[PDB]
């Protein structure tokens, strides 16, 4: 019969955290700093 309010809240918080973590997985334009 759908999510409970506690389930909705936990899922939303985990979703925001997971999306932030995935956003942090990107590489800045200079990330592969290759030594000479």
């Amino acid at each position: 019969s759908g999510y409970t309010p506690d389930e909705k809240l936990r899922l939303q918080q985990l979703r925001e955290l997971r999306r932030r973590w995935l956003k942090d997985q990107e590489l800045s334009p200079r990330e592969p700093v290759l030594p000479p």
Partner: protein, 69 residues
């Protein structure tokens, strides 16, 4: 959008392989060079009959210079 690939640290395996290759080559390139130089400059012997009144040394019964040495 390039992403970061999570991998185990491959520095140590690569370093070990580099060290093993370096040591094996350091000891083997001179060996191969010397073997080639001996082969092209000091060839093998020939099967010749024992001359009359001559007893050869025990190392004169082999044909490869390295084996004789």
């Amino acid at each position: 959008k390039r992403l970061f690939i999570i991998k185990p640290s491959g520095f140590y395996d690569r370093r070990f392989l580099k060290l093993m290759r370096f040591y094996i080559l350091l000891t083997g390139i001179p060996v191969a060079i010397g073997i080639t130089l001996v082969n092209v400059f000091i060839g093998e012997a020939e099967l010749a009959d024992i001359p009359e009144g001559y007893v050869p040394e025990h190392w004169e019964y082999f044909k490869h210079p390295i084996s004789r040495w």
